[PDB]
């Protein structure tokens, strides 16, 4: 089992869309690896589309909560919440593969039927979620907040070099040679 060996060294691999179960698994893996050694470096590999915002916040807090450094590697794609997870790595060691792409846009939500007051409360919650996502993207990047407001209005697609110029990643790795 290759995944067994990858987790055995330091590697947590995130290749499925972000929902509650996957977030719980990632959190458990991070806590276990921190329990093994609170001074080594954990690696997180992102090849997933977006997902629920609550799971995104849970994983973000979990990475920001432990001592061990988190090295984010983008591969294939990292869209929506996965982009924030990629940008949430410790500075200087957030990297992406040459042909990877990063997609960012504002959260999409769908509430059930309900009275007007319930919809107003839900709308306030959604707006504060969007503002919080904006703040997270601004904190971990070199781009000012207003430019992020302009960018996340619609779908924004960035290449590896474009992401590096944006400040989401620090290095684009080509080959081991």
């Amino acid at each position: 089992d290759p995944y067994a060996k990858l987790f055995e060294e330091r590697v947590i691999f995130l290749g499925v869309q972000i929902d509650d179960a996957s977030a719980n698994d990632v959190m458990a893996q991070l806590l276990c690896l921190e329990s093994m050694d609170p001074d080594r470096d954990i690696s997180v590999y992102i090849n997933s589309p977006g997902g629920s915002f609550t799971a995104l916040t849970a994983i973000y807090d979990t990475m920001q909560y432990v001592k061990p450094d988190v090295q984010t590697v983008c591969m294939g794609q990292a869209a929506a919440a996965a982009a924030v997870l990629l940008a949430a790595g410790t500075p200087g060691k957030r990297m992406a593969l040459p042909n990877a792409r990063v997609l960012i846009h504002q959260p999409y939500s769908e509430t059930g039927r309900g009275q007007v007051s319930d919809l107003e409360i839900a709308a306030n919650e959604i707006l504060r979620m969007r503002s919080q996502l904006e703040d997270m993207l601004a904190k971990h990047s070199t781009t000012p907040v207003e430019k992020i407001r302009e960018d996340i209005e619609r779908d924004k697609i960035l290449t590896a070099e474009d992401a590096l110029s944006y400040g989401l990643i620090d290095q684009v790795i080509s080959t081991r040679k």
Binding site: S109, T111, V116, L119, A123, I126
Partner: protein, 178 residues
């Protein structure tokens, strides 16, 4: 069926029914009947309400047609006047709103759903708030109560029999025999 001829003769007698939930089709039907009967600007038009409600836009179209044809509209609650039904029942011309003795009425705030990105949710939330405000203001104007009174009385479902509605101001009198 026989219902078509029965309704045709009732229309010949200037009687209109709303015994079903309000939607686009029945709103168009009611508006068409009102416009057709508005040819004679002297005689009155009787409209019976028995419905649990419906879409806001259709009910507002019916209300506008009622207020526009400059003919007196006598509304009768006939078993249930809920949500938009009670709004249309109270929308009748003053002094010509009635309910049958064993009739149920209720009031509550509108309900809807939201879907889309953040900006669309924002805009639709603003518009829902605005239309709720307009519904409250129109109810306050027609019933004679206070806007805050209606707002506080419509946060949840509130029920009414004939006499409680009469004293509240939803209707003007209760028909018994004639």
């Amino acid at each position: 069926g026989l219902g078509d001829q029965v309704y045709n003769r009732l229309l010949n007698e200037r009687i209109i029914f709303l015994g079903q939930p309000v939607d686009d089709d029945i709103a168009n039907k009611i508006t068409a009947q009102l416009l057709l009967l508005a040819s004679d600007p002297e005689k009155d038009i009787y409209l019976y309400i028995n419905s649990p409600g419906g879409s806001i836009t259709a009910g507002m179209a019916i209300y506008d047609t009622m207020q526009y044809i400059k003919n007196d509209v006598v509304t009768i609650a006939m078993g249930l006047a809920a949500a938009m039904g009670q709004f249309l029942l109270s929308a009748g011309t003053p002094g010509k709103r009635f309910a049958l003795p064993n009739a149920e009425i209720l009031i509550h705030q509108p309900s809807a759903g939201l879907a889309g990105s953040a900006s669309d949710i924002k805009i639709h939330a603003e518009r829902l708030l605005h239309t709720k405000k307009r519904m409250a203001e129109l109810t306050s104007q027609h019933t004679g109560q206070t806007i805050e009174q209606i707002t506080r009385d419509s946060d949840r479902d509130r029920w009414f029999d004939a006499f409680e509605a009469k004293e509240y101001g939803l209707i003007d009198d209760v028909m018994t025999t004639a």
